[PDB]
Design an enzyme around this catalytic site. Structure first.
Site, PDB file in Angstrom:
ATOM      1  N   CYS A  52      25.298  46.812  49.715  1.00 54.17           N
ATOM      2  CA  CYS A  52      24.835  47.145  48.378  1.00 54.17           C
ATOM      3  C   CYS A  52      24.105  46.121  47.726  1.00 54.17           C
ATOM      4  O   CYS A  52      24.291  44.966  47.659  1.00 54.17           O
ATOM      5  CB  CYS A  52      26.340  47.594  47.496  1.00 54.17           C
ATOM      6  SG  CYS A  52      26.990  49.070  48.439  1.00 54.17           S
ATOM      7  N   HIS A  64      29.610  48.441  40.382  1.00 52.92           N
ATOM      8  CA  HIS A  64      30.977  48.715  41.137  1.00 52.92           C
ATOM      9  C   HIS A  64      31.359  47.202  41.838  1.00 52.92           C
ATOM     10  O   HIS A  64      32.670  47.160  42.552  1.00 52.92           O
ATOM     11  CB  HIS A  64      30.795  49.683  42.114  1.00 52.92           C
ATOM     12  CG  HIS A  64      30.098  49.560  43.245  1.00 52.92           C
ATOM     13  ND1 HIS A  64      29.959  48.630  44.389  1.00 52.92           N
ATOM     14  CD2 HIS A  64      29.037  50.177  43.890  1.00 52.92           C
ATOM     15  CE1 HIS A  64      29.326  48.561  45.040  1.00 52.92           C
ATOM     16  NE2 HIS A  64      28.547  49.967  45.091  1.00 52.92           N
ATOM     17  N   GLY A  96      28.545  45.536  52.771  1.00 50.68           N
ATOM     18  CA  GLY A  96      27.901  44.296  52.373  1.00 50.68           C
ATOM     19  C   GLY A  96      26.288  44.652  51.784  1.00 50.68           C
ATOM     20  O   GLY A  96      25.899  43.477  51.561  1.00 50.68           O
TER      21      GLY A  96
END
Ligand SMILES: [Cl-]
Ligand SMILES: [Cl-]
Lengths: 301, 305
Positions: A145, A41, A143
């Site tokens: 991920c 993503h 932030g």
């Protein structure tokens, strides 16, 4: 002596964390040899996230759409591909700090250490269990991920988790390092929710053994039980069924303490019914289920 | 979201851990530049531990009586000296993995990460608070002496604890890296015991602010309190006095949440009176006191929920 929730030393993983930026989105990646792994993503804009066609979004991306930063050093991307929900970015430089490692998918009930990272920079470490409903109780802000979870066995890092999203109840969901989600979750901004959390029975029992071994003996009794009666209680309290394999794995601790598992189960039965009658076990007022038998044996013998 | 006891990434400290052996005794040392720091009781036999005279024990030692191993590399000791209860071994090699670092002595209530080690090999990392009774609630097996506690705010490792001993209640005592014990403890097998401990009030308040930041308000109430009335009540639950310094320190969390410090004090007074009525706060069924105001700011969103 003493008993604490403890993470693996994180140094071997710190040296693999990098920052990955695609357009306006920045998150973390895992740099092993000449490939950086991160959530796919990262290729998405906000509108994309609403209903992404990842095939098409990737096809329209090129190497030049990705910026990888290892500290202050820029890594040139020279290839890209997708495996399930993980993006793989081939870079021009092999990570000289790559540990010996494996990708392993963990089973519910088992634990791992999370290195929480922001902008490619490690910020903290904590231990998590993969819960029966396939979520983890982490601590993550935007932030984070691409932060990873891992275990260490001798010199070998077994990577088992990559962080992808937060669910409405504040718990966390992600994938293994091959990009396969844990649990019935998808990497799209749609309605998603944790299922009913169930309690990891074998781990609760393990922790009671840890309590006994640390001198907390008040919940013990002369009584014992059977798998079937106990499992009727477990079901009533949204505990996982206890199996014979669980009973067997707890064998060392039954021996060490002289408390058979089904004796401990009568203890647990009363605690679930009658409660903890105002006391604590190992400094908690709740029954703790994120310590595995292994986690407990490592510190109690 | 979420809120966890969160250690600092341990790598900068892992590269400093070595194994120190003297006689039959092995424990951990901290290798920074060309010095290895370890507990001076490494030079003691178990018989020596009742009433050791460390000056007389040390003068009898040669540099080659100390075996220092960094992984599989033997380090050569070329000098030694004792600074309070820490032994400093000068080695022939400066540690190339030395991080930027400093030594700090902390106060009760402060937290730090412990890198538990055995035989020079790191085994795990976890958070500890320095309790008001100058002990820590760690997890240490035999061979763990010399394990260190540290913070890594900003760019450098601040070393604040070295492990020396286990007390009869199963809690742990040690020194700063200048070798001065926290508390009244000594590196001597005396009948010594931890004092009665108390709850770190300023940290409980910080954690209640964390719960509000993370979206939970159920425990607030319509009342306030004076600081003196709060302390008169809290002391009856064996809570530490709350000082004006503590109130000032909580200002930033109060500003972020819009809850006045003394209003949050009124909430704590009520929680002590009532319990939780089957609820939890940040996942706990009891009031947690090992998160400092700084710990909460480190971990929590800057926007309240
Ligand atoms: Cl609790
Ligand atoms: Cl301090």
């Amino acid at each position: 002596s003493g008993f604490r929730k403890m993470a693996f030393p994180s140094g071997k993983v710190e040296g693999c964390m990098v920052q990955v930026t695609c357009g306006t989105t920045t998150l973390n990646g895992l740099w092993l040899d000449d490939v950086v792994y991160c959530p796919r993503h990262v290729i998405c804009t906000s509108e994309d996230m609403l209903n992404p066609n990842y095939e098409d979004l990737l096809i329209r991306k090129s190497n030049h759409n990705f910026l990888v930063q290892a500290g202050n050093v820029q890594l040139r991307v020279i290839g890209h591909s997708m495996q399930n929900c993980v993006l793989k970015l081939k870079v021009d430089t092999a990570n000289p700090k790559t540990p010996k490692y494996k990708f392993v998918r963990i089973q519910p009930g088992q634990t791992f250490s999370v290195l929480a990272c922001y902008n490619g920079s490690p910020s903290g470490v904590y231990q998590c269990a993969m819960r029966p409903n396939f979520t983890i109780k982490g601590s993550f802000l935007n932030g984070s991920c691409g932060s990873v979870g891992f275990n260490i066995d001798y010199d070998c890092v077994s990577f088992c988790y990559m962080h992808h999203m937060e669910l409405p109840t504040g718990v966390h969901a992600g994938t293994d390092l091959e990009g396969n989600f844990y649990g019935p979750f998808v990497d799209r901004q749609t309605a998603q929710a944790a299922g009913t959390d169930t309690t990891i029975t074998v781990n609760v029992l393990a922790w009671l053994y840890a309590a006994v071994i640390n001198g907390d003996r008040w919940f013990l009794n002369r009584f014992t039980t059977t798998l079937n009666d106990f499992n009727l209680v477990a079901m009533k309290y949204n505990y996982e069924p206890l199996t014979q394999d669980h009973v067997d794995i707890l064998g060392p601790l039954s021996a060490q303490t002289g408390i058979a598992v089904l004796d401990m189960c009568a203890s647990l039965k009363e605690l679930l019914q009658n409660g903890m009658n105002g006391r604590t076990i190992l400094g908690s007022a709740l029954l703790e289920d994120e310590f595995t038998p292994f986690d407990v044996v490592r510190q109690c013998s």
